[PDB]
């Protein structure tokens, strides 16, 4: 009732909740790749994350590779046009979680039980979660209501192609994505692989919390990624003013920009229990840098911070969306 | 004759190499402000750089002020509408200037002499340089021909209304800046007055070349530079693409930013002798950090890298002007 966030995506709050939760007791499960939580009116697939260098990047320093054609044919780019890119290794591990496991018969039974469905992750299980949706999107019956994807902190997954062609098949709506004011994760794939990824994945997998000694993190990582974010983010500002490709390629004396752009209607955690809510893809780049700059020093705090706020998604929308304060930039 | 730099800016190579000379001949020079410089068809007014904190900040963070409306009426703002903004040191030593000199005297001699004038300025002597050309623009009789502008490595000197102004009266295309890709001076000012201000002014005063021991720079102040660099430019992006004052302010939780903006024709070098002319100072803000981005490590190099270059225009230039590859990206 009333001007409420779950009545501007069209999820309940209690959902969000029940999904955030599920999200973070997918991970480390016995290893299976996603649990199914069954509520009043819903089904809720949860996808773990993994904390393995190999699964984030199959060569250095973007791991990337062409969207599956076959697998997501709505993906397409016409004709000749330069054809949407994805993390290979994201494409490669959900494709076998479809050969190996019965998804596709789940969710064709929870869907034939009159239940919505939802497809959830934190931190790389929201990749799992992304393409699980846009396939699913693809087989769709005519009659079935559209599943919805919700992630926390969760890496970027394709380029502007990519972005653009969900865009284009007015699918972009259906993903709500929660990112922390100075979570990294949103931000890490805006840059080259670290030659300490596995380090970084350490620190940021929940199981290191039960460790007796503590991992330390890899010294700078956090301004590291910042400044590759701010880069990408410069390079899009620049494109939109008329600079030209190869012309940015000499200002930058030729080095490699990620590919990767974030897609879908962005929830950001600002802090107080607020929330920012926008959905220009363009918007949400600018805005993954302008929120998450540091005061003081911050050189032996961000560190701790930033882990804390990545692992929070769940203590941070129960008090925000319990008691809400929400701002819309394109609604 | 051809398709030459100089006839693009419509000053001679010559002239833009004398007045790099000029500009680092004035630096400490008995303590006068300027020098006048004559050779044939020319004036050119050389403006000593000043490395006293004082004179760059009058108050932190920003020391910055109304421009004054007496002195520069062309310069104000329609109405009640928001009024042009300056560096108060820099107007009140270019004032002092005028008041304890007859430079005004001197500039209409050479006028009545045939020659054409040009204000001149490396490193901080280019706000003096800037605020001379508008000055005698304001009181320019009708058959005078315009002034001219060049500096090296100059700070900012006005916020966006203040540029505004100068585009608006037609003005913009006198000024000439010249940019080194690592120089941190042209980028300074987009961040608040550092608690070393001083120790960096040391660093790059040219007399600290003489000294039997070197100079320290203080630690990390490139990366601290080129941080506020970026936080400025993507504010500007996010304001281009819609978002609003407050809403920005309290994405990046309510922190001042700088006032400072490029205005006037930018020319970068860029290396290997190619020089980057643009106009347009949404695009100069965004050059401004996307070019000075830095590989490898750059922790124990970057400091006498960025001197050097603050300190090189004459020898870029005597090259890059020589044997051309010049690129225009709005022209």
């Known amino acids: 009732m009333g001007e409420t966030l779950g009545n501007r995506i069209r999820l309940s709050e209690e959902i969000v909740n029940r999904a955030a939760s599920q999200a973070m007791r997918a991970h480390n499960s016995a290893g299976r790749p996603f649990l199914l939580d069954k509520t009043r009116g819903f089904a809720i697939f949860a996808f773990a994350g993994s904390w393995l260098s190999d699964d984030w990047f199959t060569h250095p320093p973007f791991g990337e590779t062409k969207m599956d054609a076959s697998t997501f044919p709505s993906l397409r780019s016409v004709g000749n046009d330069e054809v949407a890119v994805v993390n290979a290794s994201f494409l490669r591990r959900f494709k076998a979680i479809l050969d190996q496991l019965p998804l596709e018969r789940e969710v064709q039974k929870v869907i034939a039980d009159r239940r919505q469905v939802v497809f959830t992750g934190h931190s790389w299980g929201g990749a799992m979660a992304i393409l699980a949706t846009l396939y699913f999107l693809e087989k769709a019956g005519p009659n079935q209501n559209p599943p919805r994807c919700?992630?926390?902190?969760?890496?970027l997954v394709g380029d502007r192609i990519f972005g653009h062609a969900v865009r284009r098949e007015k699918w972009s709506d259906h993903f709500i994505h929660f990112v922390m004011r100075f979570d990294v994760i949103?931000?890490?794939?805006?840059?080259?692989?670290?030659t300490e990824h596995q380090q970084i994945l350490n620190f940021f997998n929940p199981r290191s919390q039960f460790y007796r000694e503590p991992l330390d993190p890899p010294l700078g990582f956090y301004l590291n990624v910042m400044r590759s974010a701010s880069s990408v983010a410069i390079?899009?500002?620049?494109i939109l003013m008329g600079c030209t490709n190869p012309l940015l390629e000499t200002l930058r004396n030729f080095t490699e920009l990620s590919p990767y752009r974030p897609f879908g209607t962005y929830i950001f955690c600002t802090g107080n229990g607020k929330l920012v809510v926008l959905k220009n893809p363009d918007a949400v780049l600018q805005i993954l840098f302008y929120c998450a700059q540091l005061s003081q020093e911050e050189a032996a705090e961000i560190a701790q911070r930033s882990l804390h706020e990545?692992?929070?998604?769940?203590?941070?929308?129960?008090?925000?969306?319990?008691?809400?304060?929400?701002v819309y930039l394109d609604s």
Not at 186 to 194: D, K, N, T, Y
């Open 186 to 194: 949103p931000r890490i794939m805006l840059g080259p692989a670290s």
């Open 150 to 155: 919700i992630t926390f902190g969760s890496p």
């Open 310 to 326: 990545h692992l929070a998604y769940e203590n941070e929308l129960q008090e925000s969306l319990g008691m809400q304060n929400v």
């Open 235 to 238: 390079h899009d500002a620049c």
